[PDB]
Structures are given as structure tokens and as C-alpha cells.
């Protein structure tokens, strides 16, 4: 619901949603947005749908279908280098989706925008060093850049405090035409605990495996940590409820 509320941010300004201890349904997320492209790295897409992990990380931003190739860790494209980076060590599933016309309450940004280049001048007079975004981190160069880039070509410059480093930080902003239907890119970075998996696929106990309708039948029972083999019979309440 927090992902649905409001308008999705740019790829550099991507908001981060983290789920540590709750049952997750991939299908529920898929139902909200039709998935134009599905790709996953280090794990099968089918496997991601139903497996337990210690924690689940979801990153949501508005990303157009045309520039998807540029946003890859393998790709040397500027958008991956100066905007959003997904950690290679933990398995990452990348999903590009298009908002349905039926879906409502999703605000649309004026146009999709990305940081064309991010760099810091080591020496102001003649030295410029390119800066590559560290994995995630909401973009270090984002402070100079506005939430939505004003023009296709933009110049941003600011000066770091001396000592340190007293070096000018410079960023560039580029924009692309807005699609008639909003397109949103989702990055998922699941990690697995060695012995503990707090987040699991819905639901831990099946609806079919319930005491009701099993009356008069010998059945194995695992209720609230009490495991035994027994027959259940409906009867008038006795003892403290």
C-alpha cells in the first residue's frame, strides 16, 4: 500500500521498501501492475515466487521500457553507473511493469528523468574525476539534482567544504518523453539467513489443514507448538476459554 500511495520517484531518487518478518505474495504485486518484462539474476524467477528468505528488499521507481538495457550491472550504460545499482552478491530479481488503465490513485511524474553523469573535481582548475554510484545509497549526486530534472540538458555544480575535500561536485540531468501509460521498474534484493528465514510465502498454515471438517477422523495435529496424533470431536465449551 505505501508503494501504491503517492507518485513513484525517478530511478536515482528510488524509494526503498524492506520487509523482514511477514508472509509475502508475489502474485498480489503482479496483479497490481502488468509485467512487461521479467528478469532475475542468481535465482530462477519461478523459484523467487515461493521460497523463504531472512529478509526481502524492494526498490520502486518509474522506469521506461526503452532504456531497460542501459540499467544493468553488466551494462556500461551511464544510467546504471550514475543512478541505481543492485548488489551482485545477493540474488536480485528485476521487474519492469506498466500501470493498467483500471488501476487508480497512481500519480504520474511529468517525464522520466535520470542523472546523465555524476563527477567530483579533485582539483578545480584542471582535474575532474568521474564518480560511480555505490550499490543503492539513494545516489550521492542526488543532492544537487532536483527530484525531476528540469531540462533534457542540465548543468549542476556545488562545492564541498574544504578539509575536506574542498572539491567541486558536478552532476548532469537528462530526461525522456513520458509514456501514455506510466512504466515502473522494481528491483528486489532478497538475502538468505544461514539458519533463520523470517519472511516466507503466504501462507505458513494451509486453509485445508484446519480442525473443522476433520472431526471423527484420526489426524496429526500441530496447534500452537503442540504436536500429537488425535481425533477431534465438537463438544460444549469446558475450562477457561
Amino acid at each position: 500500500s505505501p508503494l501504491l500511495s503517492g507518485t513513484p520517484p525517478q530511478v536515482y531518487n528510488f524509494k526503498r521498501l524492506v520487509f523482514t518478518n511477514c508472509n509475502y505474495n508475489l502474485t498480489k504485486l503482479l496483479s497490481l501492475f502488468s509485467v512487461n518484462d521479467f528478469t532475475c539474476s542468481q535465482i530462477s524467477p519461478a523459484a523467487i515466487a515461493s521460497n523463504c528468505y531472512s529478509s526481502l528488499i524492494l526498490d520502486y521507481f518509474s522506469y521506461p521500457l526503452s532504456m531497460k538495457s542501459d540499467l544493468s550491472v553488466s551494462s556500461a550504460g551511464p544510467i546504471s553507473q550514475f543512478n541505481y545499482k543492485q548488489s551482485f552478491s545477493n540474488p536480485t530479481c528485476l521487474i519492469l511493469a506498466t500501470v493498467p488503465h483500471n488501476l487508480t490513485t497512481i500519480t504520474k511524474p511529468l517525464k522520466y528523468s535520470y542523472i546523465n553523469k555524476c563527477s567530483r573535481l579533485l582539483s578545480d582548475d584542471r582535474t575532474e574525476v568521474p564518480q560511480l554510484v555505490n550499490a543503492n545509497q539513494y545516489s550521492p549526486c542526488v543532492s544537487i539534482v532536483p527530484s525531476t530534472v528540469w531540462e533534457d540538458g542540465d548543468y549542476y555544480r556545488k562545492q564541498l567544504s574544504p578539509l575536506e575535500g574542498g572539491g567541486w561536485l558536478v552532476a548532469s540531468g537528462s530526461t525522456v518523453a513520458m509514456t501514455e501509460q506510466l512504466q515502473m521498474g522494481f528491483g528486489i534484493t532478497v538475502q538468505y539467513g544461514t539458519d533463520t528465514n523470517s519472511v516466507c510465502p503466504k501462507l505458513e498454515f494451509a486453509n485445508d489443514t484446519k480442525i473443522a471438517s476433520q472431526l471423527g477422523n484420526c489426524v496429526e495435529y500441530s496447534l500452537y507448538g503442540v504436536s500429537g496424533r488425535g481425533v477431534f470431536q465438537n463438544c460444549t465449551a469446558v475450562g477457561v476459554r
Partner: antibody
Amino acid sequence: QVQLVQSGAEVKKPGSSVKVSCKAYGITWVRQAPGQGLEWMGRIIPILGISRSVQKFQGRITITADKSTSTAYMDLSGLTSDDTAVYYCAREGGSGYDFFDYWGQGTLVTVSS
Amino acid sequence: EIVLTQSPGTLSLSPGERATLSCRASQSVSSSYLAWYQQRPGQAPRLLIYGASSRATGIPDRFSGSGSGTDFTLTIGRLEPEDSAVYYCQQYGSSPWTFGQGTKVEIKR
């Protein structure tokens, strides 16, 4: 403070390629027709390497700025005879502050056969 | 692109008389996004006011930036023979940025 200087005025035939050189932030190029208001042509930043052009002058002007060269070069190709004007290179504060503190001496380009 | 109206231009102003320059904008522009440039005859333009709020460094405070949204007025407290120049108001709120038609200033002593 960086002093701004420009190449000597050059007479060119129409359809030629005039490379006006502004010798040693961002570099902006302004064309002023004689007895007329100044017109902004392009915004090129040497450190960024980014190039911007006005809609009227699009696809006819190639503007290159290199930090290592420290010199901004503008090339105009297939310019019309009416295009003759004095050209000024002006320092650019940035997208947030598009005002030109320092202006180059200027180059007059004449295009008559 | 914003088309911008300008004051008529050549005016006869005695020294010590305040001079007012009008820069109306046909299309709405940012409340403080205008630049005034003064060029002496046969000389490159120099910025006087940035944002129509504060004078540029190395620029006399006699020129004052005033007005917002549509009309921007430049007022000079004192006029000198060296105040005679063409003044242009440039709006960088809308791209492409548009320079003013310009106003010639004449000082007669």
C-alpha cells in the same frame, strides 16, 4: 576570475564551416545581429562534456568544449548569408543560475560571396 | 520561449535623475528569474542584476532590480555620463532563454 578572449573576426563564404574559438564552469555562445537583440545559441560545459543547442540552430551547429583543451570551439555549417552577426562567448554559472558574468571580446563573421 | 515587451528606448535624462526601465513579459515567468545586461557602445554586455533581486559583484548598487512575475523594473538612483548604455532584460525562466529588445540610455549635461 578567468579572462575570456575570442578568435579574430573571419570572413567566410556561405555554406562554409566557421570555427570560432573562445580561449580560456560552462561556456555559452550568443549571436547578436547588428542593431538587433542578442540570441542565445548553445550551452556547452567542458568538464561535463554536455552539449545544448537552441531550437532554431539545431543540426547546423557543432559545439565542442574540452576541459583538457581548456578552449571552447563552435562550428557553424551551411550558415545563410543573413546569418552574418557578431558572436560572443559568455561564461555560464549553471542550469540553476543561467546568467553570464564574463563575456568574450567577440568575433564578427561575414558571409558574402 | 517568452516574447517580452521593453521600454521605448532612447530617452533624455539629466544627471541626478532616477531612470526607470520596464520589462513586461507576455507569458508568465518565475518571480525572481531575470538578468539585466548593460553594454557600452562597442563593448560586450556585463551583468548588472541576477534574479532581479541582487546586484552582481563589481557592479554599482545605483541600479536596482524590482518587480516580479510579469513586469520587472530597473531603477538607477543617480545618473552619470558613464551611465549611457543599452540595457537588456534576459528571462532564463523559460528555455530557450530570451534577451530583451534593449533600451538605449542618453545622458545630456
